[PDB]
Write an enzyme that holds these catalytic residues in place. Structure first.
Site, PDB file in Angstrom:
ATOM      1  N   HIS A 504       0.815  -1.197   0.000  1.00 51.58           N
ATOM      2  CA  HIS A 504       0.000   0.000   0.000  1.00 51.58           C
ATOM      3  C   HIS A 504       0.846   1.243   0.000  1.00 51.58           C
ATOM      4  CE1 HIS A 504      -2.786   2.989   2.206  1.00 51.58           C
ATOM      5  NE2 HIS A 504      -3.126   3.005   0.934  1.00 51.58           N
ATOM      6  N   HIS A 509       1.294   5.000  -2.634  1.00 48.43           N
ATOM      7  CA  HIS A 509       1.349   6.307  -2.045  1.00 48.43           C
ATOM      8  C   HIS A 509       2.672   6.986  -2.288  1.00 48.43           C
ATOM      9  CE1 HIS A 509      -2.386   6.456   0.495  1.00 48.43           C
ATOM     10  NE2 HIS A 509      -2.347   5.163   0.250  1.00 48.43           N
ATOM     11  N   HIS A 696      -3.914   0.772  -6.049  1.00 49.88           N
ATOM     12  CA  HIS A 696      -4.146   1.323  -4.717  1.00 49.88           C
ATOM     13  C   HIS A 696      -5.486   0.848  -4.171  1.00 49.88           C
ATOM     14  CE1 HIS A 696      -5.605   4.559  -1.909  1.00 49.88           C
ATOM     15  NE2 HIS A 696      -4.482   4.195  -1.316  1.00 49.88           N
ATOM     16  N   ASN A 700      -6.411  -0.888  -0.698  1.00 48.72           N
ATOM     17  CA  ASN A 700      -6.772   0.113   0.302  1.00 48.72           C
ATOM     18  C   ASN A 700      -8.159  -0.107   0.894  1.00 48.72           C
ATOM     19  OD1 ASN A 700      -5.614   3.272   1.048  1.00 48.72           O
ATOM     20  ND2 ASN A 700      -7.796   2.842   1.433  1.00 48.72           N
ATOM     21  N   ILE A 844      -6.623   8.253  -0.481  1.00 47.71           N
ATOM     22  CA  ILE A 844      -6.472   7.921   0.936  1.00 47.71           C
ATOM     23  C   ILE A 844      -5.537   6.664   1.240  1.00 47.71           C
ATOM     24  CG2 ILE A 844      -8.722   6.699   0.889  1.00 47.71           C
ATOM     25  CD1 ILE A 844      -8.063   8.960   3.762  1.00 47.71           C
TER      26      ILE A 844
END
Length: 844
Positions: A504, A509, A696, A700, A844
């Site tokens: 992740h 990110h 992602h 996520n 996020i």
């Protein structure tokens, strides 16, 4: 030149609207204030040149906003539109651009401009999504271009200079401390992470020992102690860390500040949990003590302390975090993994399945040597090949001999040994106690995997140099069965640690961010390649700055809740250095890399799966090819020949800075694509949209569904496996279910982690998903707006094939014995922790 008038429409969101306070119809009024001499707009011309200005191209006379107009939209999302009339000459030509000055007291966000009945061109739309700060904070007037999409040698000559100046402005000077109104895009190491007096950390990037992707430069002042390290904002600081002013927006409704719920969690819940659990620890004596957090909540020793916690956090948000109802203050929703069968997770059937249709389904590998060997350096790490023996699994395989099984492409391995071991000696001194794991699975004729053996290796006790001491566990009758459940929890810790850090954080990110920086720095807003990737960058930077502020800093929440602890971030560099390459992020090549798929021509895409039923793959590959099919439609609308790519000043710039700055610690690796030919642009852009959207996503938004129930996916392990003829071994026979909750994560860190991956799994009302855009006019080339309608409809089709394969009882791995249909790649979704959907971006 007989002046002739043209009617305009400017849309803009007032600042109040997007601030934290809840937006109400009340927020519109005092609208007249924007009205008057205060806001100035001047057109600029593609066709004709203003000698006087420069050779830039002519500036029309100035307008001002006259009266507001109210729209059904004005009420919803609180855009407030204004009127404006342009004295427009016949010899002006097309208005490629416009110039704005804000002379008002506060900044406003300018979404749009629309010109109606422009002579000779009909309607022209300008899409700018920029905070306009009062003219005092700028050295020259903001400029926005028309929606027309241009390459560097099809741009009008009178707009080249406006195009090149905004670029120079964007990159900034590379020095100084960046400010609130500064739209400056630049690169910096991850050195803001630690506090030298308490919890220092090494810098990430710039060194062979710690290569790492770059982050947006803040330019805060260096510390007195260390000039390597930037000064961090206080936790008790209301303001937040710099990002370019157009990477941060409000939301209308505070609930959609997922961003601040986390700030709330670090600031308020954590300090409290530390207090409560400090005076008296409690331990989960049993599994239904766990299931007490989803039934009545957990009581806090006094309502006086929560005067504070409820008080500092807006309720609507509180609800997002917690459940108000019931007799218990700390209550969370029933996770999906636990919604239809409470005890289906202690089964080996779910344990194997989750490897394919799980939270972290990208680790499983196909094994082609036995006993498995390790890729570590012989001379520094000792003998690390597996201690597994032909005997251990040999019976289990349905009569195949192992060599028959390997030959048969039917033995599969989940290898956490190699990544973990070098840091294990260090990790183990911390609160965590762990092992490195190999888990071998066998593929039964019906398409499911069964786990065979778990090997749990500890570093050699004479030091890392001499080897590893390993102890293998396998399914067995009796207490020995009880050990097998612990071996499954120690692989969970290895796994979920690889999930957060690599899957992740490192992959999505932290590795995306270098592109959003490079795109804005080197590609004009006018650029075709800009308009394609800019939906997939939205809000990525804002939330990453936050992580740095509260999540991955020294003492951060990740360190608290993940097994590496202090060494947590440091490892992801070690993993980045050794195993990250750009072309392997492409779904097919990553599949082929783990040996889960091969090239077969009479195969639907030239790719055949080794396990035909692997949900992450079979849904993902539809997605992956859908995107490729759309990046392909679109790159060949603007690049007609291959030398249009060789001669794109900006593209070549954009891709050189991607390699020698943004990921510049892998600058010299040979696998970087050259970018000479169109295909490399089709295949590299499709990598960037894949990583930002579905990659992602698939990791996520499953966090609260599957790992929201701590026992199913432990974060951390507190103890080593009980040795024989030990009191603890005695205990295992009497209460093996406690030794589970003793070995795994403590309460304090479980109520952190649940609540942290709850917010992280939530989908916002705001969120935009794959196949959508903020507004339907993002380019004035109509063939670009059908190529994208055709992408959206081929995304609707994928949503239907997915929903036909979950109803299809032929494929076992999809629903599993928890009855939790694999929805991690269902593109569309609705708000909240809905356990599905693919946002455009890493939001996020």
């Amino acid at each position: 030149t007989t002046t002739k008038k043209v009617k305009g429409t400017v849309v803009l969101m007032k600042k109040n609207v997007l601030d934290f306070n809840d937006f109400n119809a009340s927020f519109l009024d005092r609208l007249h204030e924007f009205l008057g001499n205060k806001i100035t707009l001047r057109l600029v011309s593609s066709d004709v040149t203003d000698s006087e200005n420069g050779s830039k191209g002519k500036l029309g006379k100035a307008a001002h906003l006259e009266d507001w107009i109210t729209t059904i939209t004005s009420l919803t999302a609180g855009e407030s539109a204004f009127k404006v009339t342009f004295d427009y000459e016949t010899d002006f030509g097309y208005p490629g651009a416009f110039l704005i000055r804000n002379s008002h007291f506060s900044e406003f966000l300018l979404k749009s401009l629309t010109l109606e009945d422009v002579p000779g061109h009909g309607r022209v739309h300008y899409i700018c999504n920029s905070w306009i700060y009062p003219a005092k904070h700028y050295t020259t007037d903001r400029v926005f271009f028309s929606n027309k999409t241009y390459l560097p040698h099809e741009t009008p000559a009178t707009l080249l200079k406006y195009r090149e100046e905004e670029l120079v402005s964007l990159r900034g000077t590379g020095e100084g401390e960046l400010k609130e109104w500064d739209r400056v895009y630049d690169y910096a190491y991850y050195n803001d992470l630690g506090v030298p007096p308490k919890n220092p950390r090494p810098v990430l990037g710039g060194t062979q020992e710690y290569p790492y992707p770059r982050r947006g430069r803040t330019g805060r002042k260096p510390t007195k102690e260390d000039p390597q390290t930037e000064s961090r904002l206080p936790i008790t600081s209301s303001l937040d860390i710099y990002v370019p002013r157009d990477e941060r927006f409000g939301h209308l409704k505070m609930s959609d500040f997922l961003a601040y719920a986390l700030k709330a969690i670090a600031q308020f819940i954590q300090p409290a949990l530390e207090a409560v659990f400090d005076d008296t620890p409690k331990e989960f004596d049993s599994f239904e003590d766990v299931l007490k957090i989803y039934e009545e909540g957990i009581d806090l020793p006094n309502q006086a302390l929560i005067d504070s916690i409820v008080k500092n956090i807006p309720l609507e948000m509180l609800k997002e975090i917690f459940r108000t109802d019931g007799q218990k203050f700390l209550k969370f929703p029933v996770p999906q993994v636990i919604k239809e069968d409470k005890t289906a997770w202690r089964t080996d059937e779910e344990f194997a399945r989750e490897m394919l249709a799980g939270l972290n389904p990208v680790v499983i590998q196909l094994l082609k040597e036995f006993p498995p060997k390790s890729k570590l350096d012989s001379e520094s790490y000792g003998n690390q090949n597996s201690t597994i023996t032909k005997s251990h699994i040999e019976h289990n395989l349905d009569g195949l001999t192992v060599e028959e099984a390997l030959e048969k492409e039917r033995l599969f391995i989940l290898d956490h040994h190699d990544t973990l071991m070098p840091y294990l000696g260090r990790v183990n001194t911390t609160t965590t106690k762990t092992y490195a794991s190999r888990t071998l699975l066998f593929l039964k004729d019906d398409g499911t995997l069964k786990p065979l053996v778990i090997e749990l290796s500890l570093p050699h006790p004479n030091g890392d140099k001499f080897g590893a001491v390993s102890e293998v566990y396998t399914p067995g009758e009796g207490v020995y069965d009880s050990l097998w459940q612990l071996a499954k929890a120690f692989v969970g810790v290895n796994d979920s640690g690889n999930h957060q850090l690599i899957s992740h954080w490192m992959q999505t990110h932290a590795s995306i961010e270098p592109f959003v920086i490079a795109t804005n720095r080197q590609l004009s807003v006018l650029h075709p390649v800009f308009k394609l990737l800019e939906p997939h960058f939205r809000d990525t930077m804002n939330i990453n700055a936050l992580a740095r502020q509260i999540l991955i800093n020294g003492g951060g929440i990740f360190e608290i809740t993940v097994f590496p602890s202090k060494y947590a971030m440091e490892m992801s560099s070690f993993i980045y250095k050794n195993h990250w390459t750009f072309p392997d992020q492409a779904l097919p090549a990553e599949l082929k890399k783990r040996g889960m798929a091969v090239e077969d021509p009479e195969a639907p895409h030239g790719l055949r799966l080794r396990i035909k039923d692997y949900p992450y793959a079979v849904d993902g590959l539809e997605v992956w090819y859908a995107i490729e099919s759309w990046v392909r439609d679109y790159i060949f609308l603007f690049y007609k020949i291959e030398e249009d790519i060789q001669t794109d000043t900006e593209l070549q710039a954009w891709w050189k800075e991607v390699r020698e700055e943004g990921h510049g610690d892998k600058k010299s690796e040979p696998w970087w694509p050259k970018m000479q030919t169109r295909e490399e642009l089709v295949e590299s852009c499709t990598i960037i949209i894949w990583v930002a959207s579905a990659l992602h996503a698939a990791v996520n938004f499953g966090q609260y569904p599957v790992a929201g129930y701590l026992p199913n996916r432990p974060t951390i392990s507190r103890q080593y496996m009980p040795k024989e003829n030990t009191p603890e071994f005695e205990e295992l026979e009497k209460n093996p279910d406690k030794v589970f909750l003793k070995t795994i994560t403590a309460q304090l860190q479980t109520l952190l982690g649940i609540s942290l991956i709850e917010i992280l799994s939530t989908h916002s009302s705001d969120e935009v998903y794959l196949g959508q855009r903020d507004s339907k006019e993002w380019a004035a080339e109509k063939e670009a707006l059908e190529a994208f309608e055709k992408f959206g409809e081929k995304v609707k089709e994928i949503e239907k094939n997915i929903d036909e394969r979950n109803d299809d009882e032929t494929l076992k791995n999809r629903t599993g014995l928890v009855k939790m249909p694999y929805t991690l790649l269902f593109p569309s979704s609705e708000g909240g922790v809905t356990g599905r959907g693919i946002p455009n971006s890493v939001s996020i």
